[model samples]
Target: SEQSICQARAAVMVYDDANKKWVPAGGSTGFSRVHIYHHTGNNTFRVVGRKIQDHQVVINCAIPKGLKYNQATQTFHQWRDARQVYGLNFGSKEDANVFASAMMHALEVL
Candidate 1:
């Protein structure tokens, strides 16, 4: 289900477009739980969650070249390894599998 992909991960940080820095979704200066979403409008996946004072934090996860998946740990980390500025962590093995498929499909269109 889509809701399963919305699982939370600890210490998940995202880029802050307003201040131009990486910030936590749970706090101003610490780890936080964030929710993953499929942005239909942009045809991309994004991580978003509220921080202090109800401020919205977000990060856009775009498919990068040579993106690889790790079936052992059930993750596709190392975004920087693929020349991406940021990376992502899935809360569950199934979640990672599902999202990885979507990311791979998106890469073909690019």
Candidate 2:
């Protein structure tokens, strides 16, 4: 069940390119400073990738499904705890799809 496997490894905000780490996808409403994991594997539409407050991680979960083009900011965020949150936002569905795919592949490779 690849779909289930994909759901199981829901994408999260990461830090650097090499030491990619998991981060929460909270929005401007409330800010949390923890790496989030969902049991039901539900990817909420409202959650924006602001896991790191002032740093970067602009992965837009709000991008319209099946629509790929994005003018979203490729900005970085910084964790209030002074952690660096980098490479979170995907340019398009294809970009996100690649990220998701790469993650799956990385898991297999590891």
Candidate 3:
């Protein structure tokens, strides 16, 4: 969607569900910046960001096993190897739908 393209050009603040707010990445004490990118090789969306005092965040929702996107909530949920579910709130339904569309498309391809 046009809205997603616009938001994609800008850095999205990290949403701290624990804190119930948006946090800046790489600046705040316990937060790191979030980045969204569109992958060309596989024609999908990739979210690469940072986490404070933790491993870097990498989510390719275009996976086969454990990736789910909720358009209603505008959030993307991916299950990590440790059996934990990490979420990314797109802040808007349009952005969520747009990003999820790529992942959903990839699923169909698979």
Candidate 4:
């Protein structure tokens, strides 16, 4: 088995259930590190990104003021009721590319 890593651009989004929207959660312009391993004749990859700790600060503007991430289910949750919802994921490689493009398009200063 062989292992390697690479850097790629990445962006994260948080789904808004009430508004039925997808908002930019976090992003990095420079670079992100990923890990890859070869297994059973397939090069399985585990992509990971190191984001700024302040990423949550930016996301709070798009979401409710007191909401935070629920790591167990990998979704954003509200503070008061701990609402959990998942609307977006890279179901396919194409979807992954689309995710970043969508975020770039959605980014705007208001």
lDDT of 1 by residue, 13-45 (tens): 544557887554334543334555555555555
CA error at residue 73 for candidate 3, angstroms: 2.5
- Per-model TM-score on C-alpha atoms: 0.43, 0.25, 0.41, 0.27
Q: Please give the lDDT score for candidate 4.
A: 0.34
Q: Which stretches of candidate 4 lie over 4 Å from their true place?
A: 25-43, 52-110
Please write out the lDDT profile of model 4 over residues 49-108, one tens digit for every residue: 344443232222222323332323222221222553422333344544443333232222
Alpha-carbon shift of residue 63 in model 2 (angstroms): 26
Write the candidate numbers in order of decreasing TM-score: 1, 3, 4, 2
Clashes of each: 0, 8, 4, 0
In model 2, what lDDT does residue 64 have?
22
Instruction: Give the least accurate 10-residue stretch of model 2, judged by summed lDDT.
Output: 1-10
Candidate 3 lDDT over 15-59, as tens digits, reads 556777644433433433344454555545445555535645433
* Backbone clash total, candidate 4: 0
The local lDDT score (0 to 100) that residue 74 gets in candidate 2 is 31
In candidate 3, stretches whose alpha carbon ends up further than 4 angstroms from where it belongs are: 1-47, 50-62, 65-72, 75-82
- Kindly indicate the candidate among 1 and 3 with the higher TM-score: 1
**Candidate 2's residue-wise lDDT over 15-81, tens digit each?**
4436555444433322322222222334322223333346444443322233223223432222221
Candidate 2 global CA lDDT score: 0.34
Kindly report which residue pairs in candidate 4 clash with one another.
none
Top TM-score prediction, candidate number: 1
Winner of 2 and 3 under TM-score? 3
The worst-scoring run of ten residues by lDDT in candidate 4 lies at 31-40
